[PDB]
């Protein structure tokens, strides 16, 4: 019985080993919007007689 306790404690220590890490790489990334129209900013000014 006391041997099972000693053997169990050793197995607990051996099981404390770490395997790996996992993380997401998202820094520096931004979403993109879509502009549907082109701004021209033009107006045609014409006289009444058209000259």
């Amino acid at each position: 019985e006391d041997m099972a306790k000693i053997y169990g404690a050793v197995a607990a220590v051996s099981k404390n080993v770490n395997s790996s890490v996992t993380y997401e790489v998202k820094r520096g990334t931004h979403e993109l919007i879509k502009v549907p129209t082109i701004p021209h900013n033009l107006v045609l000014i014409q006289s009444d007689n058209g000259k």
């Binding site: 006391d2 000693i6 404690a9 050793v10 220590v13």
Partner: protein, 50 residues
């Protein structure tokens, strides 16, 4: 100055006989506990660095 004679009656000798069995039991348990703990340390832990 007021030393008194020690009386060793049957009750006191009988009481010590009970204590002798209790003392013998305690030593056996501690030896088993020491042996178990000494085995655990060797298998589990190791040296320490800085």
């Amino acid at each position: 100055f007021a030393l008194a004679q020690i009386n060793a009656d049957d009750e006191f000798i009988g009481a010590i006989d009970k204590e002798s069995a209790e003392y013998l039991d305690e030593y056996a348990t501690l030896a088993r506990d020491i042996s178990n703990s000494l085995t655990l340390v060797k298998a589990a832990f190791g040296p320490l660095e800085r």
